[PDB]
Amino acid sequence: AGFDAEQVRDKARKDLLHLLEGVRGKKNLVIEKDLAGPLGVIVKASTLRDYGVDNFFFLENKNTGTSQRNIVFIARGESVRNAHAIAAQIKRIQRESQTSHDFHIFWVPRRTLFSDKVLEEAGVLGDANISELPLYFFPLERDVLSLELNDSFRDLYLAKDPTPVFLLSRALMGIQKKHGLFPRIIGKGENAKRVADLLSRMRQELLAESDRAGLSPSTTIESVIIIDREVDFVTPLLTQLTYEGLIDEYFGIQNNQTDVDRKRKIQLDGSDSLYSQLRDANFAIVGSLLNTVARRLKSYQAEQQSLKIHSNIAEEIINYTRTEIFNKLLEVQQNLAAGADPSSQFDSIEELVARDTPLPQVLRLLCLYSCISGGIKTKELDHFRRLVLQGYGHQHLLTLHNLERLQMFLSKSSPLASMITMSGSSGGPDQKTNYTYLRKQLRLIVDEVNEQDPNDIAYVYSGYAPLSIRLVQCVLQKQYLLSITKGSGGGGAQGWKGFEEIVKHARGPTFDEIQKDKKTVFVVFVGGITFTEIAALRFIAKQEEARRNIVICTTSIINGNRMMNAAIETATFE
Amino acid sequence: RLATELLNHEPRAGRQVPLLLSMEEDELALDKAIESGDTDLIYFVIHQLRRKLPLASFFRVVSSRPTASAMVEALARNDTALLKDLYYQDDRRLDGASVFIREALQQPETRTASDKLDLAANLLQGNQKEHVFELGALKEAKMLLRMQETFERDLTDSFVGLSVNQTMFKLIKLGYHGRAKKIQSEFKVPERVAWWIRLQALVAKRDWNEIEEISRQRKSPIGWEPFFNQVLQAGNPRLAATFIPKCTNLEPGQTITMYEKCGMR
């Protein structure tokens, strides 16, 4: 009777088909490009064909098929780019066809007052059947839910756009409408608090005029845990060392798919038996894992071709990990994460820039430096900035400025760079996470951990435990977390109890709100989650399998390169 | 005065904003829209205040609220004079300078492009709270593409747009002597950086006469071990084996690996 990721797909599938039948007859389909990916998760192109869809088109391509009369547009509502595109698509067909053509628009997930104006100030508003398609979470896996907002990191942290927070709140509220209120809303970070505040406000607004019933606490849901991405920039900045992590690092993963060398699309999800075992494993054991599987098969048909696919992928990743540049990148990453003097890594960074390694990889090192050392020394700062400019272009004067606005690349003399301390008085409401303090207090460095049979979440970085997941363990696995530091620590209550002093040294507000068989816990990431953090959560989920069900929710699947691209200027003085 | 007070705690925090807006109760309507977290509502208030209030009054209200300030800033980027006005009145000179730099990247000619960079430098002067680096950077940028323009006129190849390092690399690969050293000297490129670029360029050029000539000197700022590795791959194991044993800081156990992979078993 509890929550199931499959019912989310089912609802999403029937919400769309109900609208595809609302339009009577046959229809051509024009969809926002970055929406087409997530849509493939909930419905196949074959099913859409069985409901009257002729051809498929992209909104950005501006070439809607004149063929069928019914022209149905499907795009995101809050988007500014889409509202003009659809209007410019109507103009570019209302006077450029021959037959009448009907226009239907499926906004995701709501019709906005902004979109009303854009079509109003285009005149094409009156000739459109506006419908709402309540799509929010896209179940990438049975334990992974995503809003699939691939620009949410840029919008939230660079552009300060609260849209992803609002959409995530509605999605979370939708779960409460069906399964009951979250007994506890536990979280860490400013945007985590903003989601909690919205859940409270939306609840009281649901009581409305006319009075409504109200909501009772859930009996199948334990609690919700919300982690703000800006609390732990370090983890995604590091190079992911899991198999799926390295695929995302090297090839890049979008909508459970990747492009190896037009190019071939490789499906990457849990439906494949072999990939379910490989995706979370540290890449160092992939070769041995592949050897065991291959020998078992020769000693159940898709596994044979899956063996060839992942043997080819791993072989290419192995080739990449053997390069001097890669190992140099890891060397700087490991030293900075371990706690070594950041100044000692200068010559290595200078070499990497000199060897013309890709800009995102260099910027990630600089941001790792800044975010883990509480800013960069003034003398070293200008030297770093000079290397970037004359190494990649003076155009990146904007790139460095964007990283400054993101507060990921700052001077030590800047008040925004200061890490939370208990000695240096108060000051700074937005003081940064103190990794120097947290490295010891939370055992961020575990040089033990064998990769053949991992015993801690630190295996996803070959010795480094993600701060984000460590904070989750402060709530979910208090005994274990104490055990790897203390011992002899009733005992199993919720909240941040036992670790309030430690979490205090992490960025943002700390909260634990009480709203008045095994249950499910929602671990929500605002600002993005990496595959390593997912793999870490799955590791923990296996340990809590008898007492808890764990479902991962997020605004998007993030990585180091996606973060830098939110800041990197692409224009190039030509 | 009373009619505004009664709405301050009920009901749907989304339909109190149009009511507050009609009563000319600005800011309060914007604050309520912001606290609602509804993007659609925040725009509606901003668009209303944009057409009703003077730009100056509009900026003040919007500047006090970071979320509202962000949206106005976001809408203008997708407007340019609006951005400059916003940043100037809020004393955000780094943001204003970024607008001019962003305009320079869109200029069809380096002459007009450098003029935009000059406008950016003008903004960073005055007050100048640690803007020394940016002023020198914009100076280098104007310096760089002016020299690259000379290269295109002489060498009939493409150079405008490349970084200092990329310009050195292409210059060395084409074997254009101290022209790369002139670029290196003018922009004060470090010794360790310049020698890595030169090494990579000569290897991609297979200029093993120049590499051997470089091996004919004593010290190396990056060491001779890079020279060993760089030459070995995609090149001579024979010429690579020249740099051993010049490689000072080594294994020190032992030396075999280098002599081993050089074919010499």
Residue numbers in the entry:
A (entry chain A): 5 to 212, 218 to 270, 296 to 333, 357 to 546, 556 to 582, 600 to 657
B (entry chain B): 520 to 597, 605 to 791
Paper text:
As an alternative, we co-expressed and crystallized Vps33 with a C-terminal fragment of Vps16 (Vps16CTD; residues 505–834). The structure of the C. thermophilum Vps16CTD–Vps33 complex was determined by molecular replacement using C. thermophilum Vps33 as a search model and was refined to 2.6 Å resolution. Vps16CTD contains an irregular α-solenoid made up of 17 α-helices arranged in a manner similar to HEAT repeat proteins. Vps16CTD binds to the upper surface of the Vps33 arch, opposite the large cleft between Vps33 domains 1 and 3. In so doing, it interacts with all three domains of Vps33, burying about 4800 Å2 of accessible surface area in the interface. The N-terminal portion of Vps16CTD lies in the groove between domains 1 and 2 of Vps33; the majority of the Vps16CTD–Vps33 contacts in this region involve polar rather than hydrophobic residues. The contact surface with domain 3b entails a mixture of polar and non-polar interactions involving Vps16 helices α8-α13; the long α10 helix packs especially extensively against Vps33. Interestingly, three residues near the C-terminus of Vps33 (residues 655–657), which are disordered in the uncomplexed protein, adopt a well-ordered conformation in the Vps16CTD–Vps33 complex. Nonetheless, despite the extensive interaction between Vps33 and Vps16CTD, the backbone conformation of Vps33 is almost identical to that observed for the uncomplexed protein (root-mean-squared deviation <0.6 Å). In the Vsp16CTD–Vps33 structure, no interpretable electron density was observed for this region of Vps33 (residues 334–356), suggesting that in the absence of crystallographic contacts the tip is flexible.
Vps33 regulates fusion in the endo-lysosomal membrane system as a stable subunit within two large multisubunit tethering complexes, HOPS (homotypic fusion and vacuolar protein sorting) and CORVET (class C core vacuole/endosome tethering). Vps33 shares the overall shape and topology observed for previously reported SM protein structures. Following the nomenclature introduced by Misura et al., Vps33 contains three domains: domain 1 (residues 1–138; red), domain 2 (residues 139–248 and 502–667; green), and domain 3 (residues 249–501; blue), with domain 3 further subdivided into 3a (residues 249–380) and 3b (residues 381–501). The C. thermophilum Vps33 and Vps16CTD–Vps33 structures provide a first detailed view of an SM protein from the Vps33 family and of its recruitment into a multisubunit tethering complex.
